[PDB]
């Protein structure tokens, strides 16, 4: 995030000098070497005033007494060092102390005492903006094409810190020489964006014909139950953008999901949640309608999912009105990420807001139980209702993914609106060929 | 080397003292009247221990009762004293205890002996070693054998309870004094002794300041002269006013005030909930003083917020009845009810998940703690239907709660309109124009009895009842 540049910024244009130094520079093999270097530091400062002291990795130095070599003994000593300069400090000598840290949890809390770190200033995440005028601030340096939008890519990359941004810059410039381009293009952008989020492709590594029609049945069930539920009920949920097969890193397969903004990932009321719920099972219902009762695992990751969430509508949150007494832990902890489903509705899926409470009765905790078995049956027997009412679309969708490895979400819009709702399957067997698709994006 | 100069630290430049400056004074005559003391067969108590919650100033303390004593100090860290190697540490404090000896008079200070004040046998390591052999060093210096009678020791510890049994007997810590957190008069004596150093105005009601800052320590006082000093060129105004250090005390309370972009049907659920927890804790005795409700959006809490202050001394003793805990409950199922009540049962929300299980756990805990009628208390079985049936009192008691909190939010639904668009248009309500609403659209509010009127009528019953018994007894027998 650039503490340091920050930290740089503020001496620069205060005119000051600038000592930048290292805690883990203050942590040797002899004791008290890091004390005197402290009080040389000190003293330099107090010398050229003013001045700004910076520290960076303080935590290094400042970590905490943890009841979960003689290096223990250096780093307290040093930490107490430390302590007597800042506590030592008169106010009217003009010399300004900044620490710089990554993990707040670790520091010593007598450093956060007042009078030694007086302010305590979060450097957040960059928003969209300020993803756009970073972008902007590092494409200023390299030869750009006009055809590259810096605003989409800074609306479209959530979270990422402006060091990200300057190395997906450098990577599509190391892209652009790799293909001979003159230039940075939108495709080097979108390849080096790809590179960072998913990986670069493989080399024909493929598996049979068999273990890819699986994979690509429940990604387009996906986004085709997600597409449906966009198009009739008009549902508060995100949109495809791309379906890929090809492995990418250590996936096999990938839904490229558009975030939605964070206004809408605070009230997350019960249709929506429900609606969700519905599109968590619609792999396992594509898996139903297209291969009969012979499903397979690839369907049973996101069946995980939906048999948490439902927990989660009926313990954590109580959104029904038989009220519970107590919540239960996630048994399995997954972390929210990249391609995969999104489970960050709420911020997260599987992280319990610390309202659990360990049991006493336990038939209420089987009649929980019975009621989220009842749930969870209704929402898949209705989200496989949803999708055998349209097999045409899906099964067409289903073989140009397969035939062209790739789709977009377009491309699926378009199969919905060619392919309306009770269509014949003989239509689409009796196509030239199901692989094709007329439309050119 | 353990020896400090310039030592100018007095009673006057400490606040918030009380009569443990008397117990300081004691001190002071210890080292001043010695001789009448010795004179009338009085053994010298060297061992006097501060204890306390952090941020009282006992480095301060040992400082001012050191200045008035007009001896020299010492002031020493604890954690110098343990080593990875054994055998430095208790020659230091062998050191430390001859050098405070040749010094006489004088009184030294040590702080913070839980890093080697602690039990004997709880680690197993070279270190835990270390730690006993300066621990059997300091004992038998303080104690062991005869020639000190004119050094004395200083302790300051936060946690009383790791402290040896062999220190606290007596002859080698005796005395122990606990210095509180501060009450009202002791914050207005630090903030006003931390204040001399700026320049201030006549008008200033430090009353209302010490009143928002309700149980914080003179650290955080401190805190609060330091965000008193700086944060006005933003305004550029004259001089240190009321409202200046009232703000300062709301930041350090809760947090920075900042603005984002918003929807409007966010407000206007936001300022729902805090309309539901104001309107039902309104209609309660056990929070009715209201001061502020707001839907700002704040650093770590994005919700908004009331404030209620009933006088903390019930806590502190315990003396809380069960109708003060079935009516919080109540409270705490304010928003979700006001939800079934505007959104419908098929659009609830997922605001209130804290609020309701905060609801669910004071339930249990009521359940629990032997306030239940049930048999009689007994929160204890062994068979398995009684252990069974407990937590189906805590539903019971949940939904009861439930059931009075929506028929609380319905009677007032006009209060609940109104107070809900001030809310979204102001985002900030006192107590003053709240209360003037709750006047206007408010309903009934029957107050039950307290225990002085249920003790009244229950008095003059069983006098007339006893004096009925009386006449029934005389004029049956005369």
């Given at each position: 995030c650039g503490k340091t540049l920050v930290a740089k910024a503020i001496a620069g244009e205060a005119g000051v000098p600038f000592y930048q130094m290292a805690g883990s520079e203050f942590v040797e093999v002899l004791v008290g070497v890091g004390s005197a270097r402290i009080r040389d530091l000190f003293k330099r400062a107090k010398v050229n005033k003013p001045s700004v002291i910076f520290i960076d990795e303080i935590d290094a130095l400042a970590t905490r007494r943890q009841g979960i070599n003689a290096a223990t003994q250096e780093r307290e000593t040093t930490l107490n060092q430390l302590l007597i300069e800042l506590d030592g400090f008169?106010?009217?000598?003009?010399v300004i102390f900044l620490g710089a840290t990554?993990?707040?949890?670790?520091?010593?809390p007598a450093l956060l005492r007042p009078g030694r770190f007086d302010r305590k200033i979060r450097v957040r995440p960059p928003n969209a903006k300020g993803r756009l005028d970073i972008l902007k601030i590092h494409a200023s340096k390299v030869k750009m094409s006009?055809?590259?939008?810096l605003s989409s890519y800074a609306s479209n990359l959530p979270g990422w810190s402006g060091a990200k941004l300057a190395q997906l810059v450098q990577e599509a410039a190391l892209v652009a020489v790799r293909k001979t381009h003159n230039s940075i293009l939108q495709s080097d952008m979108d390849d080096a964006v790809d590179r960072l989020t998913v990986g670069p492709t493989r080399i024909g590594l493929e598996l049979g014909h068999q273990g890819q029609c699986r994979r690509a049945t429940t990604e387009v069930g996906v986004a085709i139950t997600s597409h449906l539920l966009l198009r009739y009920e008009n549902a508060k949920i995100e949109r495809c953008d791309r379906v890929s097969i090809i492995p990418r890193g250590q996936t096999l397969s990938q839904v490229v999901f558009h975030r939605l903004d964070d206004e809408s990932y605070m009230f997350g009321r019960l249709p929506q949640l429900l609606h969700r719920l519905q599109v968590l099972l619609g792999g396992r219902a594509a898996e139903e309608v297209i291969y009969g009762s012979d499903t397979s695992k690839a369907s049973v990751d996101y069946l995980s999912d939906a048999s948490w969430l439902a927990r989660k509508i009926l313990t954590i949150w109580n959104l029904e009105n038989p009220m519970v007494i107590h919540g239960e832990p996630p048994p399995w902890r997954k972390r929210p990420q990249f391609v995969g489903p999104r489970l960050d509705f709420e911020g997260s899926l599987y992280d319990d807001y610390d309202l659990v409470e360990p049991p006493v009765n336990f038939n209420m905790d089987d009649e929980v139980a019975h009621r989220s078995e009842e749930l969870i049956s209704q929402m898949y027997n209705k989200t496989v209702s949803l999708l055998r009412q349209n097999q045409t679309a899906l099964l067409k969708t289903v073989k140009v993914l397969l035939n062209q490895k790739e789709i977009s979400g377009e491309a699926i819009d378009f199969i919905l609106d060619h392919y309306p709702p009770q269509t014949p399957l003989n239509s689409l067997l009796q196509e030239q060929n199901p692989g094709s698709l007329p439309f050119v994006p | 080397e353990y020896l400090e100069r310039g030592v100018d630290v007095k009673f006057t430049d400490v606040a918030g003292l009380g009569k443990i400056r008397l117990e300081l004074e004691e001190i002071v005559k210890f080292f001043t009247h010695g001789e009448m003391y010795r004179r009338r067969g009085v053994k010298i108590p060297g061992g006097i221990l501060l204890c306390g919650?952090?941020?009282?100033g006992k480095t301060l303390l040992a400082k001012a009762v050191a200045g008035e004593a007009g001896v020299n100090f010492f002031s020493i860290s604890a954690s110098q004293f343990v080593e990875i190697y054994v055998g430095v540490g208790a020659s230091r404090v062998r050191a430390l205890y001859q050098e405070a000896r040749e010094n006489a008079p004088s009184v030294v200070f040590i702080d913070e002996l839980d890093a080697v004040g602690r039990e004997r046998g709880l680690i197993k390591g070279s270190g835990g070693q270390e730690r006993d052999a300066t621990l059997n060093q300091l004992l038998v210096s303080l104690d062991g054998f005869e020639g000190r009678g004119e050094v004395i020791t200083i302790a300051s510890t936060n946690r009383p309870d790791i402290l040896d049994p062999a220190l606290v007997r007596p002859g080698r810590f005796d005395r122990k004094i606990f210095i509180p957190k501060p009450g009202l008069i002791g914050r207005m004596e630090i903030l006003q002794v931390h204040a001399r150093k700026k320049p201030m105005a006549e008008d200033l009601d430090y009353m209302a300041v010490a009143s928002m800052t309700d149980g914080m320590v003179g650290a955080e006082l401190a805190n609060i002269v330091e965000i008193?000093?700086?944060?006005?060129m933003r305004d550029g105004r004259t001089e240190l006013t009321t409202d200046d250090l009232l703000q300062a005390a709301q930041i350090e309370e809760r947090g920075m005030l900042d603005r984002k972009d918003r929807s409007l049907e966010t407000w206007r659920q936001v300022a729902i909930n805090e309309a539901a927890m104001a309107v039902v804790a309104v209609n309660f005795p056990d929070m009715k003083n209201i001061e502020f409700l707001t839907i700002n959006p704040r650093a770590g809490r994005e919700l908004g917020y009331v404030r209620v202050k009933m006088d903390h001394i019930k806590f502190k003793e315990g003396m809380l009845s069960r109708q003060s805990i079935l009516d919080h409950i109540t409270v705490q199922l304010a928003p979700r009810a006001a939800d079934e009540l505007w959104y419908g049962e098929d659009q609830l929300s997922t605001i209130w998940a804290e609020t309701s299980d905060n609801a669910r756990s004071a339930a249990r805990s009521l359940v629990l703690g032997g306030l239940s009628d049930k048999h009689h208390g007994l929160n204890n079985f062994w068979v398995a239907d009684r252990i069974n049936d407990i937590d189906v009192e805590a539903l019971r008691i949940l939904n009861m709660c439930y059931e009075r909190a929506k028929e609380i939010l319905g009677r007032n639904r006009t209060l609940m309109d109104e107070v809900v668009e001030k809310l979204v248009q102001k985002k900030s309500l006192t107590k003053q124009e709240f209360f003037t609403l709750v006047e206007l659209y408010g309903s009934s509010k029957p107050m039950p009895p307290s225990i002085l009127e249920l003790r009244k009528i229950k008095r003059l019953e069983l006098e007339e009842m006893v004096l009925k018994l009386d006449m029934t007894t005389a004029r049956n027998s005369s």
């Amino acid at each position: 995030c650039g503490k340091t540049l920050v930290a740089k910024a503020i001496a620069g244009e205060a005119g000051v000098p600038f000592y930048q130094m290292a805690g883990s520079e203050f942590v040797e093999v002899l004791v008290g070497v890091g004390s005197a270097r402290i009080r040389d530091l000190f003293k330099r400062a107090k010398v050229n005033k003013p001045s700004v002291i910076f520290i960076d990795e303080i935590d290094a130095l400042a970590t905490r007494r943890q009841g979960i070599n003689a290096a223990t003994q250096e780093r307290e000593t040093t930490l107490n060092q430390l302590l007597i300069e800042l506590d030592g400090f008169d106010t009217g000598k003009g010399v300004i102390f900044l620490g710089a840290t990554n993990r707040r949890d670790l520091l010593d809390p007598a450093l956060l005492r007042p009078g030694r770190f007086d302010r305590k200033i979060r450097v957040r995440p960059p928003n969209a903006k300020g993803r756009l005028d970073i972008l902007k601030i590092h494409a200023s340096k390299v030869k750009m094409s006009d055809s590259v939008d810096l605003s989409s890519y800074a609306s479209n990359l959530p979270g990422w810190s402006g060091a990200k941004l300057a190395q997906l810059v450098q990577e599509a410039a190391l892209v652009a020489v790799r293909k001979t381009h003159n230039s940075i293009l939108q495709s080097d952008m979108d390849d080096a964006v790809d590179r960072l989020t998913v990986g670069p492709t493989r080399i024909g590594l493929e598996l049979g014909h068999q273990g890819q029609c699986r994979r690509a049945t429940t990604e387009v069930g996906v986004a085709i139950t997600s597409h449906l539920l966009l198009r009739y009920e008009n549902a508060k949920i995100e949109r495809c953008d791309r379906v890929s097969i090809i492995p990418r890193g250590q996936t096999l397969s990938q839904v490229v999901f558009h975030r939605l903004d964070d206004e809408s990932y605070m009230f997350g009321r019960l249709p929506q949640l429900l609606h969700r719920l519905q599109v968590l099972l619609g792999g396992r219902a594509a898996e139903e309608v297209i291969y009969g009762s012979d499903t397979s695992k690839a369907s049973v990751d996101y069946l995980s999912d939906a048999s948490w969430l439902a927990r989660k509508i009926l313990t954590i949150w109580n959104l029904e009105n038989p009220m519970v007494i107590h919540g239960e832990p996630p048994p399995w902890r997954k972390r929210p990420q990249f391609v995969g489903p999104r489970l960050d509705f709420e911020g997260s899926l599987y992280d319990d807001y610390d309202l659990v409470e360990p049991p006493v009765n336990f038939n209420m905790d089987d009649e929980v139980a019975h009621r989220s078995e009842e749930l969870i049956s209704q929402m898949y027997n209705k989200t496989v209702s949803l999708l055998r009412q349209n097999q045409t679309a899906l099964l067409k969708t289903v073989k140009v993914l397969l035939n062209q490895k790739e789709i977009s979400g377009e491309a699926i819009d378009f199969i919905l609106d060619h392919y309306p709702p009770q269509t014949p399957l003989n239509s689409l067997l009796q196509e030239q060929n199901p692989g094709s698709l007329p439309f050119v994006p | 080397e353990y020896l400090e100069r310039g030592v100018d630290v007095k009673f006057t430049d400490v606040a918030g003292l009380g009569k443990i400056r008397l117990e300081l004074e004691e001190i002071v005559k210890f080292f001043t009247h010695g001789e009448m003391y010795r004179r009338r067969g009085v053994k010298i108590p060297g061992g006097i221990l501060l204890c306390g919650p952090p941020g009282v100033g006992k480095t301060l303390l040992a400082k001012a009762v050191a200045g008035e004593a007009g001896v020299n100090f010492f002031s020493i860290s604890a954690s110098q004293f343990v080593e990875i190697y054994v055998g430095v540490g208790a020659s230091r404090v062998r050191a430390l205890y001859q050098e405070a000896r040749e010094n006489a008079p004088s009184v030294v200070f040590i702080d913070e002996l839980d890093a080697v004040g602690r039990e004997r046998g709880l680690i197993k390591g070279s270190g835990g070693q270390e730690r006993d052999a300066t621990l059997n060093q300091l004992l038998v210096s303080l104690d062991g054998f005869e020639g000190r009678g004119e050094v004395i020791t200083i302790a300051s510890t936060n946690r009383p309870d790791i402290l040896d049994p062999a220190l606290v007997r007596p002859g080698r810590f005796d005395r122990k004094i606990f210095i509180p957190k501060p009450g009202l008069i002791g914050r207005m004596e630090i903030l006003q002794v931390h204040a001399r150093k700026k320049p201030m105005a006549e008008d200033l009601d430090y009353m209302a300041v010490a009143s928002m800052t309700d149980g914080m320590v003179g650290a955080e006082l401190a805190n609060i002269v330091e965000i008193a000093a700086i944060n006005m060129m933003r305004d550029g105004r004259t001089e240190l006013t009321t409202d200046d250090l009232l703000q300062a005390a709301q930041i350090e309370e809760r947090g920075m005030l900042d603005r984002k972009d918003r929807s409007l049907e966010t407000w206007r659920q936001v300022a729902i909930n805090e309309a539901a927890m104001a309107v039902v804790a309104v209609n309660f005795p056990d929070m009715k003083n209201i001061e502020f409700l707001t839907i700002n959006p704040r650093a770590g809490r994005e919700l908004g917020y009331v404030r209620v202050k009933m006088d903390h001394i019930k806590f502190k003793e315990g003396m809380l009845s069960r109708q003060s805990i079935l009516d919080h409950i109540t409270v705490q199922l304010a928003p979700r009810a006001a939800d079934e009540l505007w959104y419908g049962e098929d659009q609830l929300s997922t605001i209130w998940a804290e609020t309701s299980d905060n609801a669910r756990s004071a339930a249990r805990s009521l359940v629990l703690g032997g306030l239940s009628d049930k048999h009689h208390g007994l929160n204890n079985f062994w068979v398995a239907d009684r252990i069974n049936d407990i937590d189906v009192e805590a539903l019971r008691i949940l939904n009861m709660c439930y059931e009075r909190a929506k028929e609380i939010l319905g009677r007032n639904r006009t209060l609940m309109d109104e107070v809900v668009e001030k809310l979204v248009q102001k985002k900030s309500l006192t107590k003053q124009e709240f209360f003037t609403l709750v006047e206007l659209y408010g309903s009934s509010k029957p107050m039950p009895p307290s225990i002085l009127e249920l003790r009244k009528i229950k008095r003059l019953e069983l006098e007339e009842m006893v004096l009925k018994l009386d006449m029934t007894t005389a004029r049956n027998s005369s």
